[PDB]
Amino acid sequence: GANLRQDESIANLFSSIKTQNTQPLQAGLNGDFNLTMLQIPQVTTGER
Amino acid sequence: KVLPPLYDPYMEAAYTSSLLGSIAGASWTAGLSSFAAIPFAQSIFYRLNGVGITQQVLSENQKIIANKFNQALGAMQTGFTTTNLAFNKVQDAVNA
Amino acid sequence: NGVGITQQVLSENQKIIANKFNQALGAMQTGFTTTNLAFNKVQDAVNA
Amino acid sequence: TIDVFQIATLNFTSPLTLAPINSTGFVVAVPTNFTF
Amino acid sequence: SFAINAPNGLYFFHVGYQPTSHVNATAAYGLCNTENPPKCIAPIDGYFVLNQTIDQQWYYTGSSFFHPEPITEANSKYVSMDVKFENLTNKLPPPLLS
Amino acid sequence: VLNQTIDQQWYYTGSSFFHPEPITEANSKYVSMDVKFENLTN
Ligand SMILES: *[C@@H]1O[C@H](CO)[C@@H](O[C@@H]2O[C@H](CO)[C@@H](O)[C@H](O)[C@H]2NC(C)=O)[C@H](O)[C@H]1NC(C)=O
Ligand SMILES: *[C@@H]1O[C@H](CO)[C@@H](O[C@@H]2O[C@H](CO)[C@@H](O)[C@H](O)[C@H]2NC(C)=O)[C@H](O)[C@H]1NC(C)=O
Ligand SMILES: *[C@@H]1O[C@H](CO)[C@@H](O[C@@H]2O[C@H](CO)[C@@H](O)[C@H](O)[C@H]2NC(C)=O)[C@H](O)[C@H]1NC(C)=O
Ligand SMILES: *[C@@H]1O[C@H](CO)[C@@H](O)[C@H](O)[C@H]1NC(C)=O
Ligand SMILES: *[C@@H]1O[C@H](CO)[C@@H](O)[C@H](O)[C@H]1NC(C)=O
Ligand SMILES: *[C@@H]1O[C@H](CO)[C@@H](O)[C@H](O)[C@H]1NC(C)=O
Ligand SMILES: *[C@@H]1O[C@H](CO)[C@@H](O)[C@H](O)[C@H]1NC(C)=O
């Protein structure tokens, strides 16, 4: 029961993805603000 | 047995990426039903304007504000030491 | 109106809004099943 | 579907991203239909 | 929100405004004319949208429902100059008229 | 605020940053009479 409740709580927390509109952030400088630290790097050599 | 977490780290990455992409918006409307495709820099400047900084100051100190924000984001690295309280909380959760 | 719906729309779609509200109140019954999380919480409190 | 269990992968598809326009202003998705 | 009685507490029915269909509307941060002291306006609890009631003819719509309406002092507020605002030389709203 | 852009000449400044600006209807609102308010003749 404890594990089931934890799973339900985490699913509830992560469910915000399905109903959240976003915009595609530019890689690196977003205007003059540098968000490279918080963005996932994209490398073609391997998997994402 | 130690059960695996409900989600792959890729799903958590998707959650955090959606959080990063959800930051920008109108930030002045009455409700939450409409999404405005306002870029990140414009949203940050609008947040600064709502804070109490007039548009003349924002227009004059554009590069200065951007540089200070970038300096803060760069200094975010140094907080992952034992001195910081939040990192201590992370290590405390791991230790528990 | 406070949500962000102007008075012109509210005056135009009065019956439509009332019908949607009534449909929501009538569909409130369907939530008393084992699938709903809040009903599960009620039964969990009773079980504790 | 009542013979063998299948293994699926959880994947949350976020709603389509509203790409900002290079015009003067911006594009906003304003509702035209709603429910309660 | 409506609260009813549950066996060991209170059961809340949170009624919320859920949109189903959206429309992509060309909006403006604000509008103002060409005067030596400029007079720039911004929407109140809404957007300055472009689509006609049924381009330089700007209307006002609510945040939670698309319904273009003429821009007046009822749904607009006076703000300082912003360089992202639209410079209007024709079809000025009554707030922008001198 | 009172300081000049660079006394009875009053300017407007933001809460979070000092930058005096001319007082207009954009940054001011009409309120009822208050005794502590400054009576301006010029
Ligand atoms: C934006 O921030 C990123 C990440 O902090 C910077 O990229 C770093 O640049 C330095 C200096 O060239 C390199 O040594 C690092 O390897 C880079 N990556 C990281 C993760 O630190 C970048 O220079 C910043 N500025 C711009 C204009 O993109
Ligand atoms: C609306 O007009 C204003 C005022 O003329 C413009 O703001 C100027 O834009 C130029 C060109 O980008 C800048 O160099 C100036 O610094 C801005 N300010 C001033 C006070 O001149 C604004 O760009 C115009 N906006 C649109 C959308 O056409
Ligand atoms: C601005 O003028 C108003 C109106 O004359 C002043 O308010 C009066 O102040 C006197 C003296 O303190 C009081 O006895 C009165 O009751 C106040 N009200 C009215 C309606 O006369 C106010 O004091 C002046 N303020 C300044 C800063 O000089
Ligand atoms: C809203 O959607 C309903 C069905 O959900 C439909 O009957 C109605 O005509 C729509 N109203 C519009 C598009 O204005
Ligand atoms: C609005 O544009 C998005 C892409 O930015 C698209 O997915 C959506 O269908 C559009 N909505 C319309 C045309 O009503
Ligand atoms: C309708 O709305 C769109 C929003 O993108 C706008 O570009 C267009 O000019 C409008 N058309 C009319 C005829 O009002
Ligand atoms: C500068 O600001 C001070 C604030 O105490 C004010 O008293 C003073 O008159 C101002 N001086 C000028 C020249 O604007």
TrEMBL record, chain E:
Which positions form S-S bridges? C32-C40
Q: Which residues are glycosylated?
A: N24, N51
Name of this chain's protein: Spike protein S2'
Native organism is Bat coronavirus HKU5
Task: Give the shown range, full length included.
Answer: 1128 to 1231 of 1358
